[PDB]
Amino acid sequence: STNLKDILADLIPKEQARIKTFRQQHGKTVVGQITVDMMYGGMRGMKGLVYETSVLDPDEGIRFRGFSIPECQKLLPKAKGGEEPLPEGLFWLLVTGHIPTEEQVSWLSKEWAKRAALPSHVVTMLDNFPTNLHPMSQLSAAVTALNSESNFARAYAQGISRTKYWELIYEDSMDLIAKLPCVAAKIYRNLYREGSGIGAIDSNLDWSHNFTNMLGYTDHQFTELTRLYLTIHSDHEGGNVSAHTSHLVGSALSDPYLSFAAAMNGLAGPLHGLANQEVLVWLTQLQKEVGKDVSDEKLRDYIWNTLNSGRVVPGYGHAVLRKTDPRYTCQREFALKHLPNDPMFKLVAQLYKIVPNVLLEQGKAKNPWPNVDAHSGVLLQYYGMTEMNYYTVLFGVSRALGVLAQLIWSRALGFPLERPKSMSTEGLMKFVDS
Amino acid sequence: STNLKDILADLIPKEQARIKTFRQQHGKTVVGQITVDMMYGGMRGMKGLVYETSVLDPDEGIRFRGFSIPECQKLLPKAKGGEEPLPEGLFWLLVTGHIPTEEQVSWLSKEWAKRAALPSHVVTMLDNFPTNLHPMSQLSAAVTALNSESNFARAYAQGISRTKYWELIYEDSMDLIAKLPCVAAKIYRNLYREGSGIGAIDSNLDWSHNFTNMLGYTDHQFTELTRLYLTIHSDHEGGNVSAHTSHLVGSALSDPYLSFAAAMNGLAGPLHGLANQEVLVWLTQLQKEVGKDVSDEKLRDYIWNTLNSGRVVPGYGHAVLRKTDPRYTCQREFALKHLPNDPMFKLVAQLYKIVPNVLLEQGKAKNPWPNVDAHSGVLLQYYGMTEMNYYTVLFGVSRALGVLAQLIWSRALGFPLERPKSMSTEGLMKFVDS
Numbered sequence: 001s002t003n004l005k006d007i008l009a010d011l012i013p014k015e016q017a018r019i020k021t022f023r024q025q026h027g028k029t030v031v032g033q034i035t036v037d038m039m040y041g042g043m044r045g046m047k048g049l050v051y052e053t054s055v056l057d058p059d060e061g062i063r064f065r066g067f068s069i070p071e072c073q074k075l076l077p078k079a080k081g082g083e084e085p086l087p088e089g090l091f092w093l094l095v096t097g098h099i100p101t102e103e104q105v106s107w108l109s110k111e112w113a114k115r116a117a118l119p120s121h122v123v124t125m126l127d128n129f130p131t132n133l134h135p136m137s138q139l140s141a142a143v144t145a146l147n148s149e150s151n152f153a154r155a156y157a158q159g160i161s162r163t164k165y166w167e168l169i170y171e172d173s174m175d176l177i178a179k180l181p182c183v184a185a186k187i188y189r190n191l192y193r194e195g196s197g198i199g200a201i202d203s204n205l206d207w208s209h210n211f212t213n214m215l216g217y218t219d220h221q222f223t224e225l226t227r228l229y230l231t232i233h234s235d236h237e238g239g240n241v242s243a244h245t246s247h248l249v250g251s252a253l254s255d256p257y258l259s260f261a262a263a264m265n266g267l268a269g270p271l272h273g274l275a276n277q278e279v280l281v282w283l284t285q286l287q288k289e290v291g292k293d294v295s296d297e298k299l300r301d302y303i304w305n306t307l308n309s310g311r312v313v314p315g316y317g318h319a320v321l322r323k324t325d326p327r328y329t330c331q332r333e334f335a336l337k338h339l340p341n342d343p344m345f346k347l348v349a350q351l352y353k354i355v356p357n358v359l360l361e362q363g364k365a366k367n368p369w370p371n372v373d374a375h376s377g378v379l380l381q382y383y384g385m386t387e388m389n390y391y392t393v394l395f396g397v398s399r400a401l402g403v404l405a406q407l408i409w410s411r412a413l414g415f416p417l418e419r420p421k422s423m424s425t426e427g428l429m430k431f432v433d434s
Numbered sequence: 435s436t437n438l439k440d441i442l443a444d445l446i447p448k449e450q451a452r453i454k455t456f457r458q459q460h461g462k463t464v465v466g467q468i469t470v471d472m473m474y475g476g477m478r479g480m481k482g483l484v485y486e487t488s489v490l491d492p493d494e495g496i497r498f499r500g501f502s503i504p505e506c507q508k509l510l511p512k513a514k515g516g517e518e519p520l521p522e523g524l525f526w527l528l529v530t531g532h533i534p535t536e537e538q539v540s541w542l543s544k545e546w547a548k549r550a551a552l553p554s555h556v557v558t559m560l561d562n563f564p565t566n567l568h569p570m571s572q573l574s575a576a577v578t579a580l581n582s583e584s585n586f587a588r589a590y591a592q593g594i595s596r597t598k599y600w601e602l603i604y605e606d607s608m609d610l611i612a613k614l615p616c617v618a619a620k621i622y623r624n625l626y627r628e629g630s631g632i633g634a635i636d637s638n639l640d641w642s643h644n645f646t647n648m649l650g651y652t653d654h655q656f657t658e659l660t661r662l663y664l665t666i667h668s669d670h671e672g673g674n675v676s677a678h679t680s681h682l683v684g685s686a687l688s689d690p691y692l693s694f695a696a697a698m699n700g701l702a703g704p705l706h707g708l709a710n711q712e713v714l715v716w717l718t719q720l721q722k723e724v725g726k727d728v729s730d731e732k733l734r735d736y737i738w739n740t741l742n743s744g745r746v747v748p749g750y751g752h753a754v755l756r757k758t759d760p761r762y763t764c765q766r767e768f769a770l771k772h773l774p775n776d777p778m779f780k781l782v783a784q785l786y787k788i789v790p791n792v793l794l795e796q797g798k799a800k801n802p803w804p805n806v807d808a809h810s811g812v813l814l815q816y817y818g819m820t821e822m823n824y825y826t827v828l829f830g831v832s833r834a835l836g837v838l839a840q841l842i843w844s845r846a847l848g849f850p851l852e853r854p855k856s857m858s859t860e861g862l863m864k865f866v867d868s
């Protein structure tokens with residue numbers, strides 16, 4: 001009823017059967033071709049893996065178990081007094097395929113509060129890290145070190161039945177998600193608040209609120225922003241580096257801690273998790289150079305100059321998209337409600353009215369619309385979260401929700417080791433001649 | 435000259451132009467098909483990536499830049515007064531595609547000696563890790579923490595040209611390889627020798643010898659074993675989880691420290707890097723039940739009984755190999771030379787005589803021949819290294835050579851982000867129906 005674990009136990013046989021049926025009908029059906037170019041091009045365009053939790057709708061943006069962002073905003077439980085979807089709800093959705101009730105979300109909040117304690121060896125290690133070790137490296141190292149807590153790793157050693165893997169994956173994933181705000185808050189405080197304590201978990205608060213408390217923030221609007229942010233960055237299909245990495249490392253039966261840590265190493269890559277930062281830097285430098293009271297015309301002028309030097313307009317354009325990412329719109333509405341007077345926000349709203357100015361005036365992009373990362377920095381900075389080197393840690397805490405919901409299902413469904421075949425250039429040149 | 439970095443700088447343009455033409459002429463050529471089953475089955479049999487350093491014939495086993503293990507055992511430099519190939523030469527081969535001279539190997543030993551220092555925060559973290567944190571977790575966490583020393587990460591943030599990425603990746607890889615024995619030996623001694631010190635690096639020893647010194651082994655044969663072990667586990671194509679994880683995380687421009695630590699979390703998975711231990715636990719059990727000097731007859735009994743009960747013979751089979759693993763034969767040759775009368779070895783050899791026979795007599799094999807992991811445990815245990823949980827740390831140190839060699843090249847050749855397309859079961863169903 002409230003116990004997600006039993007609800008999941010009842011859902012798994014149905015999904016197994018549905019998959020078995022489809023594979024028995026179509027296992028040998030060709031869904032795509034592999035070219036030499038795909039091999040050299042990072043598997044671009046190649047349908048490579050099954051990932052159940054989210055799908056990119058090319059006319060509506062990301063869908064979470066079939067629900068668009070606007071639909072999650074309407075349907076997911078809010079905190080009492082709140083307008084923003086609780087990440088607990090999102091996770092319940094990703095795991096079950098169902099919108100939770102308020103009571104299920106409350107049960108989930110309390111489950112994560114109960115599991116939130118850090119072992120001292122991780123507290124120690126975090127407390128010993130130097131300030132020149134990047135927050136993401138601290139996050140990954142700590143999560144790795146938490147695997148001393150792994151239920152799954154120990155059960156596997158004892159010879160547990162395959163039919164039970166998902167249960168221990170579930171437990172470890174619940175433990176991890178509950179711990180992550182503690183880890184992330186310890187890093188923030190050690191780096192930017194002189195090593196002060198994170199304080200206590202409150203059994204009766206949602207996950208986002210316990211998080212913003214441990215960070216040392218008090219602002220209701222910042223907790224609402226955090227609720228939204230953690231919901232919308234939660235999952236984006238399986239093919240992004242962080243999801244894929246978790247998937248790949250999980251497929252070797254590495255526990256959730258190791259899988260998630262590896263994922264965070266992928267997220268730390270400049271081409272995956274640093275878009276938030278690049279935008280904000282660019283906005284800062286812009287606003288200082290043209291002033292707050294900049295007119296459309298002069299701002300338009302600036303953008304043209306930027307692009308006349310083959311410099312990118314950060315956060316406009318994407319890999320796979322076709323319209324304003326609802327993940328942006330979502331933050332825009334937030335800002336228009338809560339900080340309409342803020343200068344940097346007013347610039348970001350001004351860049352939205354003007355920048356689309358055709359990336360088809362080129363032909364060498366694919367989209368003139370802003371992605372999620374064009375809006376996130378200004379909101380964080382507005383609320384006093386100015387340490388841009390930490391922004392990817394927030395993305396990482398969000399992304400836990402998606403990749404762990406999927407990891408539970410991958411083991412439930414008995415997905416095997418991921419092991420594609422590689423070839424060398426020499427090998428391939430020979431292969432194409434034969 | 436002897437400077438590998440200048441030699442590599444001269445090779446790269448050649449290979450760039452050769453790939454550019456090949457892709458121009460044959461980029462659209464189809465090399466394979468994707469089926470529904472491949473998507474559900476972990477990309478099994480799917481040509482997914484280009485990986486230049488090594489190629490596995492299902493038939494004759496791994497080739498390092500076109501050279502088999504037997505060929506490398508003869509051609510690669512040895513230590514003065516030794517018979518086993520030095521890992522240094524293997525790395526040189528993987529990087530350049532050329533067999534090194536003695537002098538080049540000597541230069542590379544000294545480069546690694548000089549780069550071997552750990553920063554104080556990493557020494558501290560290792561000394562503080564508790565005894566219930568697995569060696570592989572310690573190794574991954576430590577390597578992640580070393581990324582404070584990344585030249586690549588700092589250059590990237592300053593806006594270095596893409597033409598130069600390979601240089602900083604090379605520098606960081608050389609630093610990581612140099613440090614890994616220090617990290618590995620600290621772990622070993624902290625866990626298994628009550629925290630005693632690793633001592634010092636000798637500037638004129640090879641990498642493997644410095645390593646065994648720091649582990650506390652002084653036996654010349656154990657150094658020779660280590661030299662061979664680190665050479666032969668170095669690389670096994672791009673599709674294995676450790677190499678693939680490194681490739682995938684690397685493709686987001688994460689530095690070698692992050693890429694490698696992610697790879698280790700993959701290696702730590704039971705389906706990837708725990709086979710050695712699983713073999714050795716099975717053999718030990720076997721040699722209790724059926725006694726010390728068992729007869730072929732009684733041995734074949736146990737093997738039949740194992741198969742009958744639906745139980746697996748660890749150490750036999752593979753995801754692509756379909757014949758005796760040359761990495762096994764290697765370890766056999768070493769055993770026949772150095773420890774023929776060892777009882778546990780006699781069993782391993784006995785099992786090679788029996789197990790392949792009965793495995794086909796059954797016919798549910800696909801690969802009835804032993805892989806590397808069938809043979810390594812009894813060699814390690816022979817020399818006093820009985821801490822099974824540590825064995826995968828040795829594999830990891832070896833594998834750095836292959837994956838970092840390839841990572842230099844991936845960046846040199848400008849390989850993009852790895853980003854396959856995922857699909858849900860529902861989405862795939864709809865895709866196929868359309």
Ligand SMILES: CC(C)(COP(=O)(O)OP(=O)(O)OC[C@H]1O[C@@H](n2cnc3c(N)ncnc32)[C@H](O)[C@@H]1OP(=O)(O)O)[C@@H](O)C(=O)NCCC(=O)NCCS
Nearest residue numbers: 709745746747748749750751752753798799800801805807
């Ligand atoms: C390596 C391994 C996992 C590859 O399996 P795979 O490619 O998925 O499977 P195969 O093509 O061999 O499958 C044929 C059947 O023979 C079985 N099989 C393979 N090797 C076997 C062995 N040594 N003993 C018993 N059964 C074996 C498989 O499990 C499979 O059984 P099933 O079809 O009834 O489910 C498998 O051979 C194995 O279990 N090896 C033992 C562990 C080991 O040594 N691993 C180290 C390599 S990474």
Ligand SMILES: O=C([O-])CC(=O)C(=O)O
Nearest residue numbers: 235236240241272319320
């Ligand atoms: O995948 C994308 O297009 C955006 C992204 O990096 C993520 O959310 O993972």
